[PDB]
């Protein structure tokens, strides 16, 4: 979403989001850090190609051709510089000249020290309460973005971790069609399509970076939860990490965990889809969680089996046509969890990443809310580990990642919605140790 200095009337009407870095000579004199050689304000590249025929409402939705409905000029940064005003570095690089390499290690949460476990939990909690220093979220679609009087931008501050929740919601929300009409839901800019793995990889990377700056700890890293244990229970749902079941309500989190204090955003879908508004920063009820609780649906009462991870890493093509939740022999669709681990599509099957979401039988299993439960972070870093191992094992073969005819939002060169600055799926389709500055300490079965 947008740098708080781009969420003004001036910026939105010019279509330019090219903020200053250190504007010595006055405003506008250091856009994109051009005085320092770090970047320059220039035209946005956005994907032109056709998408699948499943979305019929070209022209109606602000997530189309992202971000051209809001800005047509951004900062491009030179070299290994990066960020909304080119004032930081590309993933894997540090220093004022962005010329020092770093490599941080993402580890299994159960293998951390008592002190490292406590530091992680207290850091999530701080992110939940700490206002994001750069990004503000929009509460109205673009037509009403400047407010009733036309001069009041409809943006709100939000916490670091609620930003993480918001962007996932924005990429899954329905297309508003107008009051009186049913909003359109056959669209998902981050699920059911080739962009699944790369969307969520940038999602994690932006959170890791935000927390590093919040803690001032360059080497802070996000752990993972190995959920492919076949267990009846959530082995990380304990009060020293992530929270156990409350004894007073079997669908709430233990009061001995900070996460029982969290309150969720984006849970008023009735309003958003009828009034045409967006999720805002006001929090509501608590997290609901009930591991193995879905008696009505016995298939989602046990976690994926260790063999399932072995099997899906044998699927060799990243994706297959029609590039959707009914793709067969698609590694994206297998690890996302709409195929079985072998790649066999069946409308009833729920494996791997999907299964892990449904196992929680609660807030974590509802697509518009699931990042509110912080197990989301650990569930997706493990999914990203599987992604990374595939990228290594098949030499990052991006050839099956379609350039066109994918569901809207999922073409290879689509800017992932709504990340800022614009970033394409191609930019995340690399092995993480050599290119993004992080690696997984992990061993795979066979």
Ligand X SMILES: *[C@@H]1O[C@H](CO[C@@H]2O[C@@H](C)[C@@H](O)[C@@H](O)[C@@H]2O)[C@@H](O[C@@H]2O[C@H](CO)[C@@H](O)[C@H](O)[C@H]2NC(C)=O)[C@H](O)[C@H]1NC(C)=O
Ligand Y SMILES: *[C@@H]1O[C@H](CO)[C@@H](O[C@@H]2O[C@H](CO)[C@@H](O)[C@H](O)[C@H]2NC(C)=O)[C@H](O)[C@H]1NC(C)=O
Ligand Z SMILES: O=c1cc(CO)occ1O
Ligand U SMILES: *[C@@H]1O[C@H](CO[C@@H]2O[C@@H](C)[C@@H](O)[C@@H](O)[C@@H]2O)[C@@H](O)[C@H](O)[C@H]1NC(C)=O
Considering only residues 45 to 84 of the shown chain, the ones binding ligand X according to CB under 6 A are 69-72
Of these partners, ligand U, ligand Y, ligand Z, none, which one is at the site of residue 370 (CB under 5 to 8 Å by kind)?
A: ligand Z
Tokens of 251: 């669908």
Site string for ligand Y, 18-37 (x = CB under 6 A): --------------------
CB of 183 to ligand Y, least distance (A): 15
- Residue 280 binds to ligand Y (criterion: CB under 6 A): yes
The Cα 246–Cα 226 span in angstroms is 23
> What does 191 interact with, of ligand X, ligand Y, ligand Z, none (CB < 5 to 8 A by kind)?
ligand Z
Cβ proximity to ligand Y: between 22 and 250 the closer is 250
Nearer to ligand Z, 36 or 367 (CB): 367
Which residue number, 16 or 109, has a Cβ lying nearer to ligand X?
16
Residue 4 interacting entry, from ligand X, ligand Z, ligand Y, none, C-beta within 5 to 8 Å by type: none
73-77 and 39-43 strand pairing:
antiparallel
Shortest Cβ 420–ligand U spacing (Å):
16
Asked if residues 264 and 285 have their Cβ atoms less than 8 Å apart, the reply is: yes
**Which residues make beta-bridge pairs with 316?**
none
Alpha-carbon torsion 434, 437, 443, 446, what sign? negative
Instruction: Identify the burial level of 58 via C-beta atoms within 10 angstroms of its C-beta, where 0-12 means exposed, 13-18 middle and 19 or more buried.
Output: exposed
- The binder of 72, among ligand X, ligand Y, ligand U, none, by C-beta within 5 to 8 A per type, is ligand X
Q: Report, in Å, the least distance between residue 325 CB and ligand Y.
A: 8
Exactly one of 80, 157, 268, 431 binds ligand Y (CB under 6 A); which one? 268
Q: Which residues bind ligand Z (CB under 6 A)?
A: 191, 354, 357-358, 365, 367, 370
Q: How far is the CB of 72 from ligand X (least distance, A)?
A: 4
* Contact flag: residue 14 with ligand X (CB under 6 A): yes
Beta-sheet strands, E only, within 47-204: 73-77, 81-82, 88-89, 93-94, 100-101, 104-106, 135-138, 155-156
The helix/strand/coil state of 34 is helix
- Binding residues (CB under 6 A) for ligand U: these are 4, 131, 133, 136, 155-157
Q: Are the C-beta atoms of 341 and 269 separated by less than 8 Å?
A: no
Residue number with CB closer to ligand U (83 or 223): 83
Residues 125 and 119: beta-carbon distance below 8 Å: no
Nearer to ligand U, 407 or 418 (CB): 418
Query: Beta partners for 224?
Result: 108
- Which residues neighbour 361 within 8 Å (Cβ) at sequence distance 6 or greater? 289, 290, 291, 292, 293, 294, 300
Residues that bind ligand X (CB under 6 A): 13-15, 69-72
């Amino acid at each position: 979403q947008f740098p708080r200095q781009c969420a003004t009337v001036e910026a939105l009407r010019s279509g330019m989001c090219c903020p200053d870095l250190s504007p010595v000579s006055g405003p506008g004199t250091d856009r994109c850090g051009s005085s320092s050689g770090r970047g320059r304000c220039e035209a946005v590249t956005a994907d032109s190609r056709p998408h699948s025929p499943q979305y019929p409402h070209d022209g109606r939705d602000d997530r189309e051709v992202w971000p051209l409905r809001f800005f047509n000029r951004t900062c491009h940064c030179n070299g290994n510089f990066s960020g909304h005003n080119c004032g930081t570095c590309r993933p894997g690089w540090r220093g004022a000249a962005c010329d020092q390499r770093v490599l941080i290690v993402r580890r299994n949460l159960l293998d951390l020290s008592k002190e490292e476990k406590n530091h992680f939990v207290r850091a999530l909690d701080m992110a939940k309460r700490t206002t994001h220093p750069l990004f503000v979220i929009a509460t109205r679609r673009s037509e009403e973005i400047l407010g009733p009087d036309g001069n009041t931008p409809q943006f709100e501050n939000i916490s670091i971790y609620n930003y993480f929740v918001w962007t996932h919601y924005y990429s899954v929300k329905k297309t508003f069609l107008g009051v009186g009409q049913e909003s359109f839901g056959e669209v998902d800019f981050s699920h059911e399509g080739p962009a699944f793995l790369t969307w969520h990889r940038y999602h994690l990377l932006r959170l890791e970076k935000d927390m590093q700056e919040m803690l001032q700890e360059p080497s802070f890293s996000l752990p993972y939860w190995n959920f492919a244990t076949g267990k009846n229970v959530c082995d990380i749902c304990t009060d020293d990490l992530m929270g156990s079941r409350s004894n007073f309500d079997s669908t709430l989190i233990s009061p001995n965990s900070v996460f029982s204090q969290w309150r969720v955003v984006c849970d008023s879908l009735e309003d958003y889809d009828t009034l045409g508004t967006l999720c805002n920063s006001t929090e509501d009820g608590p997290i609901r969680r009930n591991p193995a609780g879905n008696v009505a649906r016995p298939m989602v009462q046990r976690l994926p089996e260790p063999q399932d991870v072995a099997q899906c890493l044998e699927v060799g093509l990243f994706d297959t046509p029609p590039f959707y939740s009914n793709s067969t022999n698609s590694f994206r669709n297998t690890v996302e969890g709409y195929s079985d681990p072998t790649g066999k599509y069946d409308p009833a099957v729920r494996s791997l990443h999907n299964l892990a979401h449904l196992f929680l039988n609660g807030t974590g299993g509802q697509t518009h809310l699931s990042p509110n439960d912080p197990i989301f972070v650990l569930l997706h870093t493990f999914t990203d580990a599987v992604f990374d191992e595939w990228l290594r094992r098949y030499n990052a073969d991006i050839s099956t990642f379609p350039l066109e005819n994918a569901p809207i939002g999922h073409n290879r060169q689509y800017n992932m919605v709504p990340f800022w600055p614009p970033v394409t799926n191609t930019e995340m389709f690399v092995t993480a140790p050599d290119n993004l500055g992080y690696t997984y300490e992990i061993q795979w079965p066979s």
